Write a protein that binds this ligand. Structure first.
Ligand SMILES: *[C@H]1O[C@H](CO)[C@@H](O[C@@H]2O[C@H](CO)[C@@H](O)[C@H](O)[C@H]2NC(C)=O)[C@H](O)[C@H]1NC(C)=O
Ligand SMILES: *[C@H]1O[C@H](CO)[C@@H](O[C@@H]2O[C@H](CO)[C@@H](O)[C@H](O)[C@H]2NC(C)=O)[C@H](O)[C@H]1NC(C)=O
Ligand SMILES: *[C@@H]1O[C@H](CO)[C@@H](O)[C@H](O)[C@H]1NC(C)=O
Ligand SMILES: *[C@@H]1O[C@H](CO)[C@@H](O)[C@H](O)[C@H]1NC(C)=O
Ligand SMILES: *[C@@H]1O[C@H](CO)[C@@H](O)[C@H](O)[C@H]1NC(C)=O
Ligand SMILES: *[C@H]1O[C@H](CO)[C@@H](O)[C@H](O)[C@H]1NC(C)=O
Lengths: 162, 206, 223, 107, 53, 54, 162, 162
């Protein structure tokens, strides 16, 4: 992906994190586990929701064909009518299919971005109090108990304290 | 999760709005449950504004930042319940919704102890106040015209799902010897639906 | 439709282990579109999520911080159920325990923890006191509306259930909440208003069930 | 002691297309195209259509003897006519401005 | 409408247009050097960046 | 002693829409739709129209 | 935003920087203040200007409706005419509205990108001669007077000198 | 570019790397040279190839004009026919030109992204065993012979070894 996180330096996703799209896995002396970053997650849900509704709604006004019939000596206008109706269908078929392709690409990249930013958010807190392992993980120099871990997820990790 | 108000009374047909203020604003993770007495909670609204399975259209939900609202567009008697909001694994404290209807005085009945119970060495005398509104009611026991203190317990039902009234029991408990020592057992009831106190009594043996 | 059927004793001695089971029908304990939770409720604490188990290419458990050191929630894929075990109980663990399914309803495939189905609840009392079945006494109608009832006295622990005429009589029935007496035993009354005319023809029997003592009693109530 | 960042995966086989890549497996997707129908002519919002069967609009309106079924038809939602109805003009001829009239009927 | 005692570069049946915008939503039938007609109620391009609270 | 990187803000209430988000407040925006007219029939480039009236 | 700078690790904008879209705030013993990075700013102005003109100009050739009238027995072609003209208006209304939405998203992200790149530009000069605080700021290990600050804004920050 | 690598912190491309779009330049005691990162490169070739074919193929179904003639008292429908055919040509001309513009922008950014990710890939292996110079280059603390260099290009750079 464009942002290098998903299926990049973070090799794979987690079956074990059920509760959100992005989050944290911690590991210390007390144990280990997954925790979803809800805010980053809810941001993503709001964006994708708005997108789908924007797509659906933009295609709201669109060509509706009507039945018109013509006799044996009105072939020209019958042909005109047919070419006209087919023409609009092809145009709207193109618009729909292309919008879906373009916005699918942007949706996948958007998730990649949200992961990258979450990783950097944590990196920028920890700074040189941890080893950046290069796989999505940070190994602490000090012991980091569950309250310490929570402060990382918080945005509250007190750097001068360690 | 902080809900407001902690309770309310409203008339049938009233528009009712309950609020939940959340520590963190997530529209997708906030839900509303309705819990009627003696039953499990039932999911009412999910993700701020989607109606739960089987939920009627008078119930709706909205979310703005950290503020979430549950609205009952037209209150029905059966909507007597406690309503809870929820984000993630946290529940609010609940809002009790009581119906507001007209004043109704209790029907009062007094029951002597059964002969069967008396053989066990105890006597229970029961006074029933049936189908009244509002909840505030005072019940006093008199035995041979003497007010009793500290030997009775009261229990009250929840609001009725059809007529929105309450019912109440007061139970006076004596030893068999004490019961047999007295004659006149009287239950005196004060309620704002009555013009003055109502007394029901019996004579032991009669 | 999914149903959740709870079982397990409602009485636990202090310091011992609470053990409940939720039996699932209409869904699989190991389903990828289910999460299996325990939640408790008490008049004091309100609603409290305790923990969960779920299968996603392997079993996972998460538990509430308040009970983490005492709690175990295990799936049984032979019997399609899941259990709650809560060690070293104290009076503060007295509550109604519910099992519930979450993650059946998801926003864009993400479990939001919305709990779409719940079990009926098991009331659990932490006490050293011992089980006692109720005595049932008639509240006899005397002399156009008559009231009659049943006094259900001196039982432990909660709850008792009362029906009338084996559930054929529901209209005008009031079964009161139990009161805890100074003896430390519970008592309640149930009852019913009926046309006084029907007293000479209709039979009225209250059916009393106290499952902790295995008591099932029927009492005829007459003038 | 460590903290790791990661993302959701599941057992999904749903696929979507993009400009640069086709058949990308994603954790969740939403189909927006209805592909199925019931194969029947139905009441539209309870209001039954006028089904002319073997009669044409001309046969109906002029009162072709074979089209007595439609002697007095109730209110309709829409009209259904075959491609080549056999009961058209029994006595051969023309219907002047036939198409302009059929258009008038759509209102 | 009647005569306005007036001059313009772009006329519609509802009134004239004096604008350097690339689009308008007055009326589809125009004459002169006109912006392009669209059915929109609102078309606003971002130039700057996301403004902060 | 420190150096910081940052960006512009102002008192603007102009809003724009995007695919993923609506009513985004931005520092600057440019309206491209003409909504108003003068409500009159006019000479077109001086040259007067033929107004047939009744 | 996609790039994580604007309303990301840089929490908010600056009312005090009036002279450009992106820039620097310095703080030392001599005092403090804002300075716009004009180049990054002028780059942004050129891109956005070109975008607006590209949008305006692409919508230059577009359907123009003409008045055509029809008698009482020409209802079919009158309808055809109406459906035809409405059809094109809806197509061009869609194109215009969708283009504005899509390009608004890209414009906001573009700014975010320019800020992220400006931040990295400075980071890549300073390297380990300053503490990356994690909020857009760099705290120097040495004293950095106004000429020192200017050399950072220059691209001329002499790393070996410190 | 959006990702800041191409014509950003990497000042210019390399005439001397002929064999791929992205890659490495190494410099040690044994000598120096260019080496293409084929995998990143082939990824880019597959994406761009698919894009072109997607573009070509989406424009496959499109309006085809037919000749229709009209007498001297059929001016209205002749005009209709003309407006109809021109209308569709302008629509498809817009679609084609806008698709090319939009996807050209995304293609250039895609390359920028691939470079940024290749740079980070290497950064994340080396960590603190090299000086990040800020121009695309990493100066090693230890001697890095040709096998050492190859292990960087591999993904196999054994960090604990140094
Ligand atoms: C974020 O996390 C910190 C650390 O976990 C929280 O601070 C602790 O809060 C708990 C519960 O309120 C207290 O029992 C501890 O005494 C606190 N300890 C420390 C070291 O801070 C903080 O409340 C959280 N803030 C949020 C989520 O905004
Ligand atoms: C990438 O290159 C490294 C280094 O050249 C390879 O590791 C060597 O592989 C050769 C040949 O297989 C062995 O004889 C050496 O003993 C290895 N030495 C070291 C220092 O690693 C690695 O096999 C290559 N990986 C690829 C091409 O994927
Ligand atoms: C994508 O999947 C479909 C159906 O599963 C298959 O027919 C098609 O060949 C695949 N396309 C590509 C480009 O691999
Ligand atoms: C048109 O607008 C310009 C600029 O606002 C103004 O100078 C001029 O007076 C207007 N012209 C007419 C004819 O109203
Ligand atoms: C956007 O803003 C307008 C006016 O401030 C408001 O009417 C509209 O409801 C808003 N739209 C959304 C999608 O929030
Ligand atoms: C920038 O500033 C430094 C220090 O003020 C000065 O010596 C140098 O000549 C300038 N370089 C530029 C503008 O490239």
């Amino acid at each position: 992906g464009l942002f290098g996180a998903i299926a990049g330096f973070i090799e794979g996703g987690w079956q074990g994190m059920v509760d959100g799209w992005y989050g944290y896995h911690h590991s210390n002396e007390q144990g280990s586990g997954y925790a979803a970053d809800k805010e980053s997650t809810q941001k993503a849900i709001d964006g994708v929701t708005n997108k789908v509704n924007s797509i659906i709604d933009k295609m709201n006004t669109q060509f509706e064909a009507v039945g018109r019939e013509f006799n044996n000596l009105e072939r020209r206008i019958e042909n005109l009518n047919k070419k006209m109706e087919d023409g609009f269908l092809d145009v709207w078929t193109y618009n729909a299919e292309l919008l879906v392709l373009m916005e699918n690409e942007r949706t996948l990249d958007f998730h990649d971005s949200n992961v990258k930013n979450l990783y950097d958010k944590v990196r920028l807190q920890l700074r040189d109090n941890a080893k950046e392992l290069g796989n999505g993980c940070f190994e602490f120099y000090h012991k980091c108990d569950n309250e310490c871990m929570e402060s990382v997820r918080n945005g509250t990790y007190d750097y001068p304290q360690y | 999760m902080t809900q407001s108000p902690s309770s309310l009374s409203a008339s049938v047909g009233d528009r009712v709005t309950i609020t939940c203020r959340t520590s963190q604003s997530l529209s997708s993770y906030t839900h509303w449950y309705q819990q009627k007495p003696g039953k499990a909670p039932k999911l009412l609204i999910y993700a701020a504004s989607s109606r739960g399975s089987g939920v009627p259209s008078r119930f709706s939900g909205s979310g703005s930042g950290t503020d979430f609202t549950l609205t009952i567009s037209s209150l029905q008697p059966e909507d007597f319940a406690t309503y809870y909001c929820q984000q993630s694994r946290t529940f609010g404290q609940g809002t009790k919704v009581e119906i507001k209807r007209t004043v109704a005085a209790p029907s009062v009945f007094i029951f002597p102890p059964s002969d069967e119970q008396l053989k066990s060495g105890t006597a229970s005398v029961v006074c029933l106040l049936n189908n009244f509104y509002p909840r505030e009611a005072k019940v006093q026991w008199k035995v041979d015209n003497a007010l009793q203190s500290g030997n009775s317990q009261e229990s009250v039902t929840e609001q009725d799902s059809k007529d929105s009234t309450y019912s109440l029991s007061s139970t006076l408990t004596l030893s068999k010897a004490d019961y047999e020592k007295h004659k006149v057992y009287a239950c005196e009831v004060t309620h704002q639906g009555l013009s003055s106190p109502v007394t029901k009594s019996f004579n032991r043996g009669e | 439709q999914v149903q959740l059927q709870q079982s397990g004793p409602g009485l636990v001695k202090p310091s011992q282990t609470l053990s409940l089971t939720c039996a699932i029908s209409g869904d699989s304990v190991s389903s990828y579109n289910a999460v299996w939770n325990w939640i408790r409720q008490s008049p004091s604490r309100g609603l409290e999520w305790l923990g969960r188990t779920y299968y996603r290419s392997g079993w996972y458990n998460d538990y509430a911080e308040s009970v983490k050191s005492r709690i175990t929630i295990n799936p049984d894929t032979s019997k399609n159920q899941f259990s709650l075990q809560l060690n070293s109980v104290t009076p503060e663990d007295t509550a109604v325990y519910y099992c519930a399914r979450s993650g059946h309803i998801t926003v864009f495939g993400v479990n939001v923890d919305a709990f779409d189905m719940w079990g009926q609840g098991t009331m659990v009392t932490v006490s050293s006191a011992s089980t006692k079945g109720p005595s049932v006494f008639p509240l006899a109608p005397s002399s156009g509306t008559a009231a009659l009832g049943c006094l259900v006295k001196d039982y432990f622990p909660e709850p008792v259930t009362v029906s009338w005429n084996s559930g054929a009589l529901t209209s005008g029935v009031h079964t009161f909440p139990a009161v805890l007496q100074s003896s430390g035993l519970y008592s309640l009354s149930s009852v019913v208003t009926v046309p006084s005319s029907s007293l000479g023809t209709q039979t009225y029997i209250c059916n009393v069930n106290h499952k902790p003592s295995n008591t099932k009693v029927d009492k005829k109530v007459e003038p | 002691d460590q903290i790791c960042i990661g993302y959701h995966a599941n057992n999904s086989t749903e696929q979507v297309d993009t400009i640069m890549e086709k058949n990308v497996t994603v954790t969740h997707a939403q189909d927006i195209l209805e592909k199925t129908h019931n194969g029947k002519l139905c009441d539209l919002d309870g209001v039954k259509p006028l089904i002319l069967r073997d009669c044409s609009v001309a046969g109906w309106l002029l009162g072709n003897p074979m089209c007595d079924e439609f002697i007095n038809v109730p209110e309709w939602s829409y009209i259904v006519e075959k491609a080549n109805p056999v009961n058209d003009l029994c006595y051969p001829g023309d219907f002047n401005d036939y198409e302009e009239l059929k258009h008038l009927l759509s209102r | 409408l009647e005569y306005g005692n007036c001059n313009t570069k772009c006329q519609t049946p509802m009134g004239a247009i004096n604008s350097s915008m690339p689009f308008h939503n007055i009326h589809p039938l125009t004459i002169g050097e006109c912006p392009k007609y669209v059915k929109s109620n609102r078309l606003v391009l971002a130039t700057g960046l996301r403004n902060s609270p």
